[PDB]
Design a protein around this ligand. Structure first.
Ligand SMILES: O=c1ccn([C@@H]2O[C@H](COP(=O)(O)OP(=O)(O)O)[C@@H](O)[C@H]2O)c(=O)[nH]1
Ligand SMILES: *[C@H]1O[C@H](CO)[C@H](O)[C@H](O)[C@H]1NC(C)=O
Ligand SMILES: *[C@H]1O[C@H](CO)[C@H](O)[C@H](O)[C@H]1NC(C)=O
Ligand SMILES: [Mn+2]
Ligand SMILES: [Mn+2]
Lengths: 13, 526
């Protein structure tokens, strides 16, 4: 076993 | 004396919104799930497979839809001095975007931006190969007011395509958007007003989610997240610290942000050029937002999120095209801006050591010409809540057992976000890091900190197993280990030693001279 996207923010805040 | 005649121009948007069908899909920014069957269902699946966005649905949502009001009501109280605000060129580079998402971006800008403030919308075709973006696009845009379409001659990547747009721009302020955005009402005035106050401010909207499958708008009126990064040099979001919240005079004032999500921001054109714009050595995608953030802070500007400016963004299901240059781009940023702290990066992403990154001589000369502050300053002043690892020689890497040859500490949480509460085990060493990367610190903790939040090994009351906790400000007693010269790993609270035990796990046992209680760090396997 072992940076391809920009994260969205979580539903939290 | 008599009132003066104001500056002429309409405060209303460049274009009015066409009449809406009352029953139109997605009209109020609501989630739409079409529940298709048969061939229509297959066409929807093919559109997701081809765009990583439900373009089947987007094609059935109005290109002129008005986002619902979601901002903090105090933003409606803001009065703007339209007669003195600068004019902006909106720059939208696009590569193989779908028809409906791109055109909805353009109509959103034209239908929400005050005419008096918008110089032009500049579309930059980064050498797209999809046919609908060729003559069909030029024909559809040809009659629109305040729209220019510029085409690259070869594949440029988002950095150099954006610079094509900036080079052609006629406004005082450059505003960058992606080709799959939708603007909240009133998004532009706060950005321009802030740059009107401070020429060296780079100002970003709060980026709201538009869901790639349902096109639901997820903007809200709460305090937004702001930008940071971890020591893999990947952008992450975090909550506004108390230090910054104390300095805000109201909830809708601007918020300083260590880094930008990238791609959505406004900046004076003269200031963007003064700072050296973008590193033209970056390719395709990734890493430029971090380099630009570091450059802004270290070279004397401010990077800010404006809570009154909201822009929705269609985050895709996954990468819609090959993103194989983010690592090299991040290395260019690290080599120019991070000084000795680049090593903390190389330790946690060893592939970066091998990645060709080209020539950064001119960016280093840029840094000297602008007399920029160093990276230690940036960490201590802009981003002090980011934990800075020590990575002391001999105290980081894989934590290998002397007696049980070729086995090392291994921790794999179920969810990458929730790391707390599972047992650390032993596993054949593979040298790839992440699950086998640990750092023994000066505060006697065994840290699991390839990414954030940092985990610290602990032993719960009366147990012999090693469990993953979160690191805290003051190390709790059950997290303190003493790593002696000979290799013994001594748990202070238990008064016991860590022993490689039978799969294989590390367990507390009474201290002996056994090699199964001897440990050592290895950076690399060979
Ligand atoms: O080689 C490229 C890659 C992307 N883009 C465009 O530049 C912006 C890059 O953003 P993208 O949305 O793909 O990245 P993300 O927001 O998902 O991180 C978008 O408008 C893309 O259309 C481009 O012009 N050339
Ligand atoms: C992949 O998973 C295995 C088993 O879950 C191990 O935890 C291994 O350490 C992981 N690989 C990496 C590189 O983290
Ligand atoms: C995350 O927070 C931002 C504000 O900073 C946006 O509201 C975004 O829509 C949020 N993400 C989700 C999925 O709701
Ligand atoms: Mn035109
Ligand atoms: Mn995007």
């Amino acid at each position: 076993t072992g940076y391809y996207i920009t994260p969205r923010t979580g539903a939290g805040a | 004396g008599p009132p003066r005649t104001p500056r002429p121009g309409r405060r209303e948007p460049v274009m009015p919104r066409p009449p809406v069908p009352a029953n139109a899909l997605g009209a109020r920014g609501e989630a739409v799930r079409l529940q298709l069957q048969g061939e229509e269902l297959r066409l929807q699946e093919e559109s997701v497979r081809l765009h990583q966005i439900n373009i089947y649905l987007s094609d059935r949502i109005s290109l002129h839809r008005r986002l619902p009001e979601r901002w903090n009501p105090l933003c409606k109280e803001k009065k703007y001095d339209y007669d003195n605000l600068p004019r902006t060129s909106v720059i939208i580079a696009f590569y193989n975007e779908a028809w409906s998402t791109l055109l909805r971006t353009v109509y959103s800008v034209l239908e929400t931006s005050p005419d008096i403030l918008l110089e032009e919308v500049i579309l930059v075709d980064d050498y797209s190969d999809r046919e609908h973006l060729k003559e069909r696009l030029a024909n559809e845009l040809s009659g629109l007011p305040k729209v220019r379409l510029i085409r690259a001659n070869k594949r440029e990547g988002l950095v150099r395509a954006r610079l094509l747009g900036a080079s052609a721009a006629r406004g005082d302020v450059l505003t960058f958007l992606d080709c799959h955005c939708e603007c909240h009402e009133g998004w532009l005035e706060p950005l321009l007003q802030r740059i009107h106050e401070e020429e060296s401010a780079v100002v970003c909207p709060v980026i709201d989610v538009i869901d790639w499958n349902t096109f639901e708008y997820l903007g809200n009126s709460g305090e937004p997240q702001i930008g940071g990064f971890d020591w893999r040099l990947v952008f992450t979001w975090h909550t506004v610290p108390e230090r910054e919240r104390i300095r805000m005079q109201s909830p809708v004032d601007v918020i300083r942000s260590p880094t930008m999500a990238g791609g959505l921001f406004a900046v004076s054109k003269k200031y963007f050029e003064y700072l050296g714009s973008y590193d033209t050595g970056m390719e395709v995608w990734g890493g430029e937002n971090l380099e630009f953030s570091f450059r802004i802070w270290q070279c004397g500007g401010v990077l800010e999120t404006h809570p009154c400016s909201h822009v929705g963004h269609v985050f895709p299901k996954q990468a819609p095209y090959s993103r194989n240059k983010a690592l090299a781009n991040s290395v260019r940023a690290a080599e120019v801006w991070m000084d000795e702290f680049k090593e903390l990066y190389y330790h946690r992403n060893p592939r970066a050591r091998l990645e060709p990154f080209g020539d950064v001589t001119e960016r280093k000369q840029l840094r000297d010409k602008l007399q920029c502050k160093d990276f230690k300053w940036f960490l201590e002043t802009v981003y002090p809540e980011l934990h800075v690892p020590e990575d002391r020689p001999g105290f980081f890497g894989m934590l290998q057992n002397k007696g049980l040859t070729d086995y090392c500490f291994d921790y794999n949480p179920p969810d990458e976000n929730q790391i707390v509460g599972h047992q650390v085990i032993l596993y054949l060493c593979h040298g790839m890091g992440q699950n086998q990367f640990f750092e023994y610190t000066s505060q006697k903790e065994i840290r699991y900190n390839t990414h954030q939040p940092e985990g610290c090994i602990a032993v719960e009351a009366g147990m012999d197993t090693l469990i993953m906790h979160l690191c805290e400000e003051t190390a709790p007693e059950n997290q303190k280990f003493i790593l002696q010269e000979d290799g013994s790993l001594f748990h202070e609270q238990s008064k016991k030693c860590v022993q490689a035990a039978r799969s294989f796990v590390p367990l507390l046992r009474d201290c002996t001279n056994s090699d199964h209680q001897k440990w050592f760090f290895k950076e690399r396997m060979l």
